[PDB]
Amino acid sequence: MKTRDKIIQASLELFNEHGERTITTNHIAAHLDISPGNLYYHFRNKEDIIRCIFDQYEQHLLLGFKPYADQKVDLELLMSYFDAMFYTMWQFRFMYANLADILARDDTLKARYLKVQQAVLEQSIAVLNQLKKDGILQIEDERIADLADTIKMIIGFWISYKLTQSSIATISKASLYEGLLRVLMIFKAYSTPDSLANFDRLEQHFRSQS
Amino acid sequence: MKTRDKIIQASLELFNEHGERTITTNHIAAHLDISPGNLYYHFRNKEDIIRCIFDQYEQHLLLGFKPYADQKVDLELLMSYFDAMFYTMWQFRFMYANLADILARDDTLKARYLKVQQAVLEQSIAVLNQLKKDGILQIEDERIADLADTIKMIIGFWISYKLTQSSIATISKASLYEGLLRVLMIFKAYSTPDSLANFDRLEQHFRSQS
């Protein structure tokens, strides 16, 4: 593992455990047992590290919500889209906790973030249309875009909702699965009779994980 | 109108137009054409004004989502609950824009905020159970609490979602109605056949407002 990649992963872990705002590049270097000069060789400031993390976030997002080509339309395919919701919230939780402030202070990062959000929305609408063609969902064509955008809003803001509903300042995997189960509920209401059985197996799988 | 109430309303308007963070007590006093000492007579600092605004927010919330006693179960009753969603987001939009930071810096305000959120959740669950008894909604009893909490999450975080999805830093009434229409969609999926007609009249009413 290249030192540059070690710096990116240590940063992500520290930001996820303690909040991005309180971690300095000197703390990151001490965590890796390197000089702050050694860190500067690879990254000149903290923003540049956060920019590389956003890129990692963005490529996983585009791949996790990509439309399906020749895959068979079965349970394993559906779980993969639900697994990508969980992964993104948990692996980049420092981001969801403080998105507005990170975007407001870096215009380059914000512009790239918006391009990806629009491309993820377009893929999601395609996925939903395919599930309709394949007999998994019943939705009026004119509402598929709205459903996709509403689910995207749930996943993106679930963490902030949880942080503002209690006196506890940390996110547990259990909090995240509660969120997936709310999305799974919404989708269950749009399912076809032929496909209700599968939504009950997804529900049982996620109640069992936590 | 008592000067104390004039100070509270000017503050709310300035915070809603420009963001709470950039408004000082000296700016509030200049807006009302009074000395900063005259303002101090009534309010010793900005937090005390924000505390009185939260109280106004809290009492409207408890009244707007209160369970129904002898009212007839008709369209006007349903619209009133939808109107309370719109009112709270629009009249206290500075709050929704910057909730986390306001709560993190005032422990007294946060404690009261959480008591009200729990009481609003309990009322909402009662409302939903009544609509079920009265033949408006079909939901498994074990899921009514989850639906209520998911709708509450949508209304509370819609504004933050919109502010982070564009380069435009302001909220329009149109953005807010788009949000209500997403909630109305979710509810339409849980409606009974006898009640679908009414959800189509609510939809048409809100598409027409914007």
β-partners of residue B191 are B137
CB contact under 8 A, A150 and B110: no
CB contact under 8 A, B99 and A164: yes
Distance, in Å, from the CA atom of A1 to the CA atom of A154, rounded to the nearest integer, reads 35
Provide the 10 A C-beta neighbour count for residue B196. Answer: 10
Distance, in Å, from the CA atom of A155 to the CA atom of A114, rounded to the nearest integer, reads 16
Contact A182, B146 (CB under 8 A): yes
Distance, in Å, from the CA atom of A86 to the CA atom of A82, rounded to the nearest integer, reads 7
Contact A162, B99 (CB under 8 A): no
What are A's interface residues with B at a Cβ cutoff of 8 A?
Answer: 99-100, 103, 110, 114, 117, 143, 146-147, 149-150, 153-154, 156-158, 160-161, 163-167, 181-182, 185-186, 189-190
Residues 6+ apart with CB under 8 A from B179: B85, B89, B154, B155, B158, B162
- Please report the sign of the dihedral spanned by the C-alpha atoms of residue A158, residue A160, residue A163, residue A165: negative
Distance, in Å, from the CA atom of B122 to the CA atom of A163, rounded to the nearest integer, reads 20
Residues 6+ apart with CB under 8 A from A113: A54, A58, A103
The DSSP 8-state label assigned to residue A166 in this structure reads S
**Joined tokens for residue B157:** 């975080």
| 3 state SS of B191 | strand
**Joined tokens for residue A51:** 């920019």
Angle at A205 between CA A200 and CA A210, to 5 degrees: 130
Distance, in Å, from the CA atom of B8 to the CA atom of A4, rounded to the nearest integer, reads 52
**Selection from B122, B130, B147 nearest residue B78 by Cα:** B130
**DSSP H or E stretch at residue A183:** helix A173-188
CA distances (Å), B192 to each of A173, A200, B71, in order? 35, 22, 20
Q: Which residue of B has its CA nearest to A138?
A: B189
**Joined tokens for residue A128:** 């939903």
> What is the biggest distance separating any 2 CA atoms in chain B, rounded to whole angstroms?
62
Residues 6+ apart with CB under 8 A from A11: A23, A28, A49, A50, A53
Phi and psi at residue B140, to the nearest 5°: -65, 135
Amino acid in the structure at residue A41: Y
Contact A207, A178 (CB under 8 A): no
Distance, in Å, from the CA atom of A161 to the CA atom of B114, rounded to the nearest integer, reads 12
Distance between A54 CA and the closest CA of chain B, angstroms: 15
- Please report the sign of the dihedral spanned by the C-alpha atoms of residue A116, residue A121, residue A126, residue A132: positive
Residue pointed to by tokens 């790239």: A112
Upper half-sphere CA count for residue A154 (Cβ side, 13 Å): 29
- A149 CB neighbours in chain B (<8 A) are 182
Distance, in Å, from the CA atom of B143 to the CA atom of B149, rounded to the nearest integer, reads 10
Expt. technique: X-ray
Smallest Cβ–Cβ distance between B189 and the set A154, A167, A189 belongs to A189
The DSSP 8-state label assigned to residue B64 in this structure reads H
CA distances (Å), A116 to each of A41, A54, A59, A63, A105, in order? 29, 10, 9, 11, 18
CB contact under 8 A, B117 and A165: yes
Proportion of chain B in helix, strand, coil states, percent, rounded to 5? 80, 0, 20
**Joined tokens for residue A69:** 């080509």
Distance, in Å, from the CA atom of B69 to the CA atom of B75, rounded to the nearest integer, reads 16
Angle at B49 between CA B45 and CA B53, to 5 degrees: 160
Phi and psi at residue A191, to the nearest 5°: -65, 160
Distance between A147 CA and the closest CA of chain B, angstroms: 8
Smallest Cβ–Cβ distance between B156 and the set A99, A161, A189 belongs to A161
Contact pairs from chain A to chain B, CB under 8 Å: 67
**Joined tokens for residue A169:** 């300042």
Distance, in Å, from the CA atom of B25 to the CA atom of B36, rounded to the nearest integer, reads 7
Q: B167-170 contacts: CB < 8 A, separation 24 or more? A: B167/A110, B167/A114
The DSSP 8-state label assigned to residue A191 in this structure reads B
Phi and psi at residue B137, to the nearest 5°: -125, 150
Residue pointed to by tokens 């490529």: A59
Proportion of chain A in helix, strand, coil states, percent, rounded to 5? 80, 0, 20
Distance between B58 CA and the closest CA of chain A, angstroms: 15
Smallest Cβ–Cβ distance between B163 and the set A100, A117, A150 belongs to A100
Q: For chain B, what's the residue count?
A: 210
CB contact under 8 A, B182 and A146: yes
Q: Which residue of A has its CA nearest to B114?
A: A165
Provide the 10 A C-beta neighbour count for residue A103. Answer: 19
**Joined tokens for residue A182:** 């709310």
**Joined tokens for residue B90:** 């629009």
Interface with chain A: mutation pick from B116, B122, B157, highest number of A CBs within 10 Å: B157
Angle at B190 between CA B185 and CA B196, to 5 degrees: 75
- A181 CB neighbours in chain B (<8 A) are 146
Residue pointed to by tokens 């992500």: A12
**Selection from B118, B120, B136, B30 nearest residue B73 by Cα:** B136
Domain B2-210 falls in which CATH fold?
Answer: Tetracycline Repressor; domain 2 (1.10.357)
CB contact under 8 A, B161 and A157: yes
